[PDB]
Each structure stands twice: as C-alpha cells, then as structure tokens.
C-alpha cells in the first residue's frame, strides 16, 4: 500500500516552480527547459479556481505573474487561461522576452500530470484550511492524482499541517506526504523521552532551508539523525553544485533548486546505475 515514491539510490532534484530563475514560474516554458536541463521533477504549488479546478500557481492573486488582477478563487479557468503568465518575467536586460509568446499560459494540475508523465511532482497545497477553496482542494488533489494513476510519482505537502492531515485521510497513505513542522517537533520530543529507541512509524519528507536565521541546517549528524528517526530529509533553495554534492553525500534525498542547470551537471558526476 505504501507508495514507492523514492526509487534508486540518487536524490531527486526538483526545479523550483519549474525553475523560476530561468523561465517564467509555473509555465510550460519553465517545465520544458528544466526537463531538458535534466531535473528529476518539478516543485510546484496549486490553487483552486471558481470552477474548483486546481491550477499550477503560487500566489492567491494573479497580479504578480500575469497581466490580470484579482484572486484565483474569483476567476474561472477560462478567464485565467486568457492571461499571460509570463507578462512580468524580466531578464537582466530589463526586457520581458516571454510576454505575449507561446506556452506562457497557466496550467492546471491535471494537464501537468498528463503532459509530463515521467516527472516527479513535489506539490504544495497553498489554499488555507479555513478557506472554502482549502476545504475541497485535498479531495480534488487526490482525484486528479487518482485519475492519472500517478500515486507513486507525486509528493503532496503543505505549510499547514491540517492540509496534510486532510489529504492523508483521503489518500489512505497511498501518496507520499511531506512532514509538518509540528510532527517533527514532537518527533524530537519522543526521541529525548524514549531515547534513541524511537523512530517515526511512517516515513515522511521534511523539506528544510539550508539556513535559517544564521543557523546552518546541513549538519551531517542532523541529516543522519533525521534518517534514523525515519524522517526523509530534504532541502530547498540549493543553488550551487558543491552544496548539491554535499547534501547528496550526507544523506539528503530531495533537492529543490531555483537553478535547474546544475541538475545536469550533478547527474554527470553520479553513476547511471544508481537511478
Ligand atoms: O513553491 P514555494 O516557493 O512555496 O516553495
């Protein structure tokens, strides 16, 4: 029943929002470029529309990344799809080279699964649990995963523990889920109480920053401790090849990078038999 999400012996490299540093975030121009650059999958976010259809989108409003205005929850999928999701992407020249071009449109989570059936999906449920969109999003998320037979290649996480709570009750543990911050805090507590005898019963991915308020979280003993706790350690914001090799040798299993170009370089270093 447990999903075999992690296969092989090489850590998965994810492009942050499809590789937002090089191409407009959440657009096909980004997913195509990152996939060409040799990434293992896409880190992404989902928002629910008025049609109750999940779209690949980060902000609650389309103002930052499109030519439109307003919340995604107030727009239809048809209205959202007339917008240019590359309208505000600027290169270092100051130009917007992808404004008005093809493949600059918003995508639904359904079309993302059908179009890239070989990529791993690390998806974030963004809508708050208190909201109306957040109540029905976990179910719609599972239905989309279920309709595309992608139980073993999608990782559903959230900043809110309750969204992971509500997705996991529907998914029956048939889809890998991210670890909440409260669950890790109470994992450390049951460790000190029960000694090293404790481990988490179900493996969950805990994605971390490489640094937080001056505190380095790349300690080899911390990564080893998490693995001994049966907590799968991962890191986002990894934008150098030496840090990628460092986390790979310490035991991290997921890497989210804004720079998908380094993924191809990382893969050349590792052997093909590990995959
Ligand atoms: O997609 P992120 O920016 O919420 O990690």
Residue numbers in the entry: 36 to 310
Provide excerpts from the study.
The lpgD gene was identified by a targeted mutant screen, and the purified protein exhibited cation-dependent phosphodiesterase activity converting LPG to a cyclic-lysophosphatidic acid (cLPA) intermediate that is hydrolyzed to lysophosphatidic acid (LPA). The 2.1 Å crystal structure shows LpgD adopts the canonical glycerophosphodiester phosphodiesterase (GDPD) TIM barrel fold except for the positioning and length of helix α6 and sheet β7 that create a hydrophobic docking platform for the LPG acyl chain. The specific physiological function of LpgD in S. aureus is to re-cycle LPG into the PG biosynthetic pathway at the LPA acyltransferase step to maintain membrane PG molecular species homeostasis.
We postulated that the actual ligand associated with His93 would most logically be a water molecule and that P2 was partially displacing the water due to the low pH and high phosphate concentration in the crystallization condition. The refined 2.4 Å structure showed a single dihydrogen phosphate ion (P1) located in the same position in the active site as was present in the initial, lower pH structure. However, the low occupancy phosphate (P2) is clearly replaced by a water molecule hydrogen bonded to His93 as illustrated by the Fo-Fc simulated annealing omit map. These data suggest His93 is hydrogen bonded to a water molecule in substrate-free LpgDΔN. The LpgDΔN structure lacks a divalent cation; however, Mn2+ is proposed to bind to the same three acidic residues as the Ca2+ of BsGlpQ. The release of glycerol allows water to enter the active site and His93 acts as general base that catalyzes the water addition to the cLPA intermediate to form the LpgD-LPA product complex.
